[PDB]
Amino acid sequence: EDVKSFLRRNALLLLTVLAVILGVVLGFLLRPYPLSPREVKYFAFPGELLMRMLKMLILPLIVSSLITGLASLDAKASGRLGMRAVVYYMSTTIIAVVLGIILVLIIEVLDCFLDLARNIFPSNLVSAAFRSYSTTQEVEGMNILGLVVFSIVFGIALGKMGEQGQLLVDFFNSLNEATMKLVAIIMWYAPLGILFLIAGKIVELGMYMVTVIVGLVIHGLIVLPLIYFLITRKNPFVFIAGILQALITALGTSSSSATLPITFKCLEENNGVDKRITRFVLPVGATINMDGTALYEAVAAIFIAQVNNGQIITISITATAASIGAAGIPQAGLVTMVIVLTAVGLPTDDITLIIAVDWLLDRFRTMVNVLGDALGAGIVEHLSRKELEKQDAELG
Amino acid sequence: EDVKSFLRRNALLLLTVLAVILGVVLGFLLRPYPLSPREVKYFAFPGELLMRMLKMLILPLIVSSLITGLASLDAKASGRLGMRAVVYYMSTTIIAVVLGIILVLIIEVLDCFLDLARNIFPSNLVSAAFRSYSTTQEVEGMNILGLVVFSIVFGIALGKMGEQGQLLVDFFNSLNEATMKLVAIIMWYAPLGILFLIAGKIVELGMYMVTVIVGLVIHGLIVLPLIYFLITRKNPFVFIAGILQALITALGTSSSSATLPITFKCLEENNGVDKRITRFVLPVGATINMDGTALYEAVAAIFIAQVNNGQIITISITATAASIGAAGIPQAGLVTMVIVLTAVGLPTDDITLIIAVDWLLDRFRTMVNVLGDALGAGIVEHLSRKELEKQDAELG
Amino acid sequence: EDVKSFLRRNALLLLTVLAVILGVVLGFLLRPYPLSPREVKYFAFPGELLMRMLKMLILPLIVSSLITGLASLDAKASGRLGMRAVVYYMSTTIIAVVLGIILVLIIEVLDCFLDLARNIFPSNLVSAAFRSYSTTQEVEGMNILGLVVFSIVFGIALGKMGEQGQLLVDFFNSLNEATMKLVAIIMWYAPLGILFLIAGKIVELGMYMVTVIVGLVIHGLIVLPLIYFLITRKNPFVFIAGILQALITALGTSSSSATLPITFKCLEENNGVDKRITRFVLPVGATINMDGTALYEAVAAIFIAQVNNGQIITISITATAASIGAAGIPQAGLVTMVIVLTAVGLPTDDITLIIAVDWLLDRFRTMVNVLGDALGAGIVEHLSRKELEKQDAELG
Ligand SMILES: N[C@@H](CC(=O)O)C(=O)O
Ligand SMILES: N[C@@H](CC(=O)O)C(=O)O
Ligand SMILES: N[C@@H](CC(=O)O)C(=O)O
Ligand code: NA
Ligand code: NA
Ligand code: NA
């Protein structure tokens, strides 16, 4: 009887679920036909248009979110909110790497460190907005990390100054809300885009793919929800229902940085999470908090060691280190595996074998990477209760 | 007796007319001499300096004009102003294509649609400001269309929010006026630049060139002025005298997007047109309203059919479609002719024959493209009388 | 007895002096070892990280400084402050070229003028922030001159408008202070960076190197200090002690444009110089006022003439002209020597011989280039006394 009101209310959520169900059907139907690379690009195009729309809003989001996020909070309160986030991030990326290692047991690398260091401190801000550094020397594609860093320091700087800083805070606050109004339009195209984005990909190792997928279920649907209930004492699967549009889009894009604007609209609107805490937890979580990637890094390094064959402590240290370094971009998990392979001693040429089934694992690990930030905000919000209480009463 | 006051008042206008008269003389004098490509570039340089100055101001103009233009107007009033503009644009591009077809009778193409679609939704705003998409994949040169789209949606978003949006409206209003103060300095260099810009070009098919030029006179000096008198009931050749500096510069540059800042100063200062309506009509008209290009597209497709040899309805549909797609950049008419040739069935390799005389036709068709936007603003302003009456009295 | 308080107070200044002393020691110790180019890059990396941090802040500094600098001053007062600066700049670059010529006596070039002219008027502002023009055609690296020009005109434009302009002035004032708060963090990394930046360079003509170095001492420590005492009637070597951190960093970077944010913090904090005058004198001085380069240009053109062999007036005219054209970037002195060699008649291929010892002379000539701007601000501030008196009392 009550399923009619469920169809009327969850209309946009159900259309995106149907987009996955019908998108998988469409792809397998069109798969036997001539798989021409130019034709595959044309077929997947309605999914490419959604990707462009989402990519567009990440820069005015990341920048405006952290500048207001850190300036709208008290001096030490900004540090406390950050400490809570960092403590949460490093523990979750440690639980996933430990859970990942146990499961797999049952079933130019210096240039990487330098390029990362170079990107933390960009030589040009206008460049940083569309270019990243990759020594061969500046490859195309936004330097998210470099902008996240600069925005954090810039936010602190406006917080340091008085009413002079207030103008820019108000400027960046108006710019945040305006781009957030645009992600409402992006959300309506999402059912159409998600269909073609996943149909195109399913158009384009046995135990391994299983170990990772099952490993992500134990972490994502059993480990992380328990952490939320242990801190907030609220039902985590009702919270996951709010951010469900953000997970379905993370499956489609396979880029947590690309689905960041929808996770903002899901945490801010569908759930009762504060903007003052989502403006910090979500942009930082999108680039450093990667639980799904950390689990994948550990399993994939030991899976190649199952064929090639005590020092799993270095693997747990570097797989958690690779999870931080890795980009909120798709296929970033296989390129950062160079660090975890060279550390143990295994050859980096073995990534080639995994590359084939990587695409599908990437879609699921992105969903767990997003989920960690989403449940993260809810955890940090509840913990930073008095900080938000002091800021609300102050205005009165 | 009264010609002395005419020389004192119209000093800058007369210097730009003299720039064309003396510029044509200078070019034909220097034409027999060694036409070295490096030497031609050096000779035309004072014209290249004007081009850089004008190109510079288009980005802070297009962006600041539409953001304030759509936010400073009421919800449905913004839609009404737009409806009036769109109705005016599509009818004028239909009259020109019909007039063009009658006169000529008397005397990778999917990748184009995809690249256009890609550009309507840019993946990066900082990139969009100096790069356009052109699959082979991101060519240099501003994505005007992508910025016009985003600015329109961003304007609407600030209009949607209340007083929070007002700060950014005021910010973008100050930024519009400041760049408009700079186009006053650009206007003084214009007589010097226009001389060398046209002298250099005249230094660098019989019936065809005539059909187009005569076709643009019937449309520009007889069709469009009659439309203005039919709606406003005001003398159109006194209005054309106000925007006369913008037409002379359109002849020189051959880029309606480049002469957009001067058409703003001509419509806002020389004529009594409202900023609230020029901020929408002029930037949108510069990229989609191309009457001179639509007339050219129809004549050039049938001129090649006069040699190569019922279905002129597809030509009228795609030539009007090419007019929208075409860029406010020079030589954009010959590249968009691919769409109108493939639609009818004629070969795209026939554009090569036309390319020679194209340059001079481009200068005249740009003047008609600008004229359509200029007389367009005057037409839409007069029609949207009550909308501006309600906004003025509200402030009181 | 008083040396203990001298160590406590001048802690950051002494750490940067020690950075040079220990940096020269470190380099000569590591010099005999395999000098691999990839290894040299890795070794110098902590110096490369400082360079990125400093480069980062130049764009939001140059732009925000001149826009507020010229808008916060009266119409003719802006012209007077400028006249004082221009008169000071051209006389100092004339004294250095005269002093340089006397000492050396005792002991595609049109494309350069066009590229400079092109860069004074950039075709795109977003591009200008990370790209310069260099015909072969748009090379990577910020167009400082093009941004300095545009910012000056934009500042004047906000000054021209009333309270409408005030919002953007306040916006650019908040943006200036916020980036100036960031150069405090950059200053703490500077001792670590300066050590590796100079150690790496000392790891990588007899009379000539001496003539230039001795020539810079006569100008920098005898000519320029006397000018300050002659105008301000204040001790110049107490003023040099304030901007001493900016000189030590100019030695390290060899780029006056890169050390511009630290010279701002030195003149604004360590010395009692007004922001209203440093916001104009320092960014303009960084690109056009190059006393150390002008002295170098004259000596290097006549040193090649000492080997290869009345018309030294053209050398003094073009060496002062090259000093203006030259970039606040390292090794910009040898590339601009093409202008001064072609003018006299000497071959440009002779720059190859000088290139070897150029690096060390560049570090010293940058220190004199910075010093001229630093003592320049102090000279112009004292001269524009009443202008600042009228602006202060007005607010009361
Ligand atoms: N796709 C992941 C990163 C990766 O593991 O490739 C993300 O966007 O978070
Ligand atoms: N030159 C025209 C476009 C074209 O037809 O090439 C304009 O700028 O409007
Ligand atoms: N290095 C100098 C320029 C040069 O002479 O190379 C400066 O930055 O001012
Ligand atoms: Na990460
Ligand atoms: Na068009
Ligand atoms: Na200079």
Cα dihedral A22, A24, A28, A33 sign: positive
Contact assessment for residue B46 and residue B252, using Cβ atoms and an 8 Å cutoff:
no
CB atoms within 10 A of CB B167: 18
Distance CA A39, CA B251 (A): 42
Residue ranges making up the domain that contains A244: 1-396
CB atoms within 10 A of CB B140: 12
Of the candidates A203, A161, A188, which has an alpha carbon nearest to the alpha carbon of residue A43?
Answer: A203
- Is A130 at the interface with chain B, CB within 8 A? yes
Of the candidates C102, C109, C105, C98, which has an alpha carbon nearest to the alpha carbon of residue C343?
Answer: C109
- Is C126 at the interface with chain A, CB within 8 A? yes
- Is C84 at the interface with chain B, CB within 8 A? no
Classify A51 as helix, strand or coil.
Answer: helix
Residue C293 in tokens? 């380069």
Whether A178 sits inside 8 A of B157 (CB atoms) is: yes
Q: What angle do CA A366, A371, A375 make, to 5 degrees?
A: 160
Strands (E), C106-261: none
Distance CA C20, CA A131 (A): 34
Of the candidates A123, A154, A140, which has an alpha carbon nearest to the alpha carbon of residue B130?
Answer: A140
Determine whether the annotation assigns residue B329 to a binding site: yes
Residue A129 in tokens? 């907005």
> After which residues do gaps appear in chain C, with C to N over 2.5 Å?
107, 136, 204, 309
- The residue whose CA has the least distance to atom 1 of ligand 3 is C330
Of all residues in chain C, the one with the smallest CA distance to B50 is C121
**Closest Cβ opposite residue C164 in set B52, B174, B182:** B174
CB atoms within 10 A of CB C328: 27
Output the CA C204–ligand 6 centroid distance in Å: 27
Contact assessment for residue B180 and residue B267, using Cβ atoms and an 8 Å cutoff:
no
Classify C131 as helix, strand or coil.
Answer: strand
Question: Which value, to the nearest 10 degrees, does the dihedral of the CA atoms of residues C375, C378, C383, C386 take?
Answer: 170
Distance CA C282, CA C278 (A): 5
Name all residues whose Cβ lies below 6 A of ligand 1. A 254-256, 290, 293, 326, 328-333, 362, 365-366, 369
Of the candidates A178, A179, A169, A180, which has an alpha carbon nearest to the alpha carbon of residue A68?
Answer: A169
C170: buried, middle or exposed (CB in 10 Å: 19+, 13-18, 0-12)? middle
Q: Is A233 left (phi over 0), alpha (psi -120 to 50) or beta?
A: left
Whether B45 sits inside 8 A of C114 (CB atoms) is: yes
- Is C192 at the interface with chain A, CB within 8 A? no
Residue B45 in tokens? 């340089």
Of all residues in chain C, the one with the smallest CA distance to B125 is C126
Q: Is C359 left (phi over 0), alpha (psi -120 to 50) or beta?
A: alpha
Whether A160 sits inside 8 A of C171 (CB atoms) is: no
Please report residues of B whose CB lies closer than 8 A to that of C114.
42, 45
Distance CA A189, CA A338 (A): 37
Contact assessment for residue A103 and residue A299, using Cβ atoms and an 8 Å cutoff:
yes
> How far from A152 is each of A72, A159, B172, C170, CA to CA, in Å?
12, 11, 25, 22
Distance CA C208, CA C371 (A): 22
Residue B300 in tokens? 């050039």
**Closest Cβ opposite residue B178 in set C114, C126, C157:** C157
Contact assessment for residue A150 and residue A38, using Cβ atoms and an 8 Å cutoff:
no
Q: Which residue has 């490859």 as its token pair?
A: A139
A205: buried, middle or exposed (CB in 10 Å: 19+, 13-18, 0-12)? exposed
Contact assessment for residue A27 and residue A173, using Cβ atoms and an 8 Å cutoff:
no
Give me the phi and psi of C188, to 5 degrees please. Answer: -80, -30
Output the CA A55–ligand 4 centroid distance in Å: 18
Of the candidates B237, B243, B254, which has an alpha carbon nearest to the alpha carbon of residue B292?
Answer: B254
The Cβ-side half-sphere exposure at A160, using a 13 Å CA radius, reads 14
Atom of ligand 1 nearest to the CA of A331: 6
Contact assessment for residue B57 and residue B261, using Cβ atoms and an 8 Å cutoff:
yes
> After which residues do gaps appear in chain A, with C to N over 2.5 Å?
107, 136, 204, 309
**Closest Cβ opposite residue B56 in set C110, C124, C167:** C124
The Cβ-side half-sphere exposure at C314, using a 13 Å CA radius, reads 12
Which method resolved this structure?
A: X-ray
What lies within 8 Å, CB to CB, of A213 at 6+ separation is A361, A364
Strands (E), chain C: none
Output the CA B245–ligand 5 centroid distance in Å: 22
Of the candidates C177, C386, C165, B112, which has an alpha carbon nearest to the alpha carbon of residue A166?
Answer: C177
Residue A374 in tokens? 């989403």
CB atoms within 10 A of CB C283: 28
**Closest Cβ opposite residue A55 in set B114, B123, B138:** B123
Of the candidates C243, C252, C241, which has an alpha carbon nearest to the alpha carbon of residue C6?
Answer: C241
Of all residues in chain C, the one with the smallest CA distance to B186 is C121
> How far from B193 is each of B49, B211, C50, CA to CA, in Å?
7, 30, 44
Of the candidates B220, B270, B226, which has an alpha carbon nearest to the alpha carbon of residue B245?
Answer: B270
Residues 205-224 of A with CB under 8 A from B: none
Strand partners, A131: A140
Cα dihedral C316, C317, C323, C326 sign: negative
Please report residues of C whose CB lies closer than 8 A to that of A122.
52, 56
Counted domains in chain B: 1
Write down how long chain A is. 396
Whether B181 sits inside 8 A of C157 (CB atoms) is: yes
A238: buried, middle or exposed (CB in 10 Å: 19+, 13-18, 0-12)? exposed
- Is A1 at the interface with chain B, CB within 8 A? no
**What type of residue sits at position B277?**
I
CB atoms within 10 A of CB A34: 6
Distance CA C127, CA C140 (A): 9
Q: Residue B174 belongs to a domain with what CATH number?
A: 1.10.3860.10
Please report residues of A whose CB lies closer than 8 A to that of B167.
170-171, 174
Distance CA B333, CA B298 (A): 11
Q: What angle do CA A90, A94, A96 make, to 5 degrees?
A: 120
Cα C71 to chain centroid, rounded: 24
Distance CA A366, CA A216 (A): 10
Task: Write out the DSSP string of C62-98.
Answer: HHHHHHHHHHSS-HHHHHHHHHHHHHHHHHHHHHHHH
Q: Which residue has 């680039």 as its token pair?
A: A287
Cα dihedral A226, A228, A229, A230 sign: positive
- Is C189 at the interface with chain A, CB within 8 A? no
**What type of residue sits at position A43?**
F
Contact assessment for residue B171 and residue C171, using Cβ atoms and an 8 Å cutoff:
yes
Residue C228 in tokens? 């300050």
What lies within 8 Å, CB to CB, of A232 at 6+ separation is A378, A379, A382
Write down how long chain C is. 396
Distance CA B174, CA B185 (A): 18
Roughly what angle, to the nearest 10 degrees, separates helices A109-120 and C37-71? 10
Atom of ligand 1 nearest to the CA of A254: 1
Cα dihedral A50, A55, A60, A66 sign: positive
Of the candidates A304, A296, A286, which has an alpha carbon nearest to the alpha carbon of residue A365?
Answer: A296
End-to-end CA distance of chain B: 46
Residue A56 in tokens? 């567009």
Distance CA C343, CA C321 (A): 11
> How far from A299 is each of A250, A305, A324, A358, A385, CA to CA, in Å?
21, 10, 17, 12, 37
Residue C263 in tokens? 């010279």
Please report residues of A whose CB lies closer than 8 A to that of B150.
56
Of the candidates C262, C335, C324, which has an alpha carbon nearest to the alpha carbon of residue C287?
Answer: C324
Distance CA B215, CA B96 (A): 9
B207: buried, middle or exposed (CB in 10 Å: 19+, 13-18, 0-12)? exposed
Q: What angle do CA C143, C146, C147 make, to 5 degrees?
A: 85
Classify A140 as helix, strand or coil.
Answer: strand
Atom of ligand 3 nearest to the CA of C370: 9
Contact assessment for residue A374 and residue A273, using Cβ atoms and an 8 Å cutoff:
no
SS (HEC) of chain B: CCHHHHHHHCHHHHHHHHHHHHHHHHHHHHCCCCCCHHHHHHHHHHHHHHHHHHHHHHHHHHHHHHHHHHHCCCHHHHHHHHHHHHHHHHHHHHHHHHHHHHHHHHCCHHHHHHHHHHHHCCCCHHHHCCECCCCCCCCECCCHHHHHHHHHHHHHHHHHCCHHHHHHHHHHHHHHHHHHHHHHHHHHHHHHHHHHHHHHHCCCCHHHHHHHHHHHHHHHHHHHHHHHHHHCCCCHHHHHHHCHHHHHHHHHHCCCCCCHHHHHHHHHHHCCCCHHHHHHHHHHHHHCCCHHHHHHHHHHHHHHHHHHCCCHHHHHHHHHHHHHHCCCCCCHHHHCHHHHHHHHCCCHHHHHHHHHHHHHHHHHHHHHHHHHHHHHHHHHHHHCHHHHHHHHHHHC
Output the CA B327–ligand 4 centroid distance in Å: 41
Distance CA B234, CA A292 (A): 69
Interface size, chain B vs chain C, as Cβ–Cβ contacts under 8 Å: 65
Question: Which value, to the nearest 10 degrees, does the dihedral of the CA atoms of residues C126, C128, C131, C135 take?
Answer: 130
- Is C178 at the interface with chain A, CB within 8 A? yes
Distance CA A81, CA A279 (A): 11
CB atoms within 10 A of CB C54: 26
Whether C121 sits inside 8 A of B49 (CB atoms) is: yes
**DSSP letter assigned to residue C336:** T
Residue C122 in tokens? 């950039």
Strand partners, B226: none
Q: Which residue has 């916020």 as its token pair?
A: C178
Helices (H), chain A: 3-9, 11-30, 37-71, 75-106, 109-120, 125-128, 144-160, 163-201, 206-218, 224-231, 236-242, 244-253, 260-265, 275-287, 291-308, 312-325, 332-335, 337-344, 351-383, 385-395
Long-range contact pairs involving B233-236 (C-beta distance under 8 Å, separation at least 24): B234/B378, B234/B382, B236/B375
Residue B137 in tokens? 């994949």
Write down how long chain B is. 396
Whether C118 sits inside 8 A of B181 (CB atoms) is: no
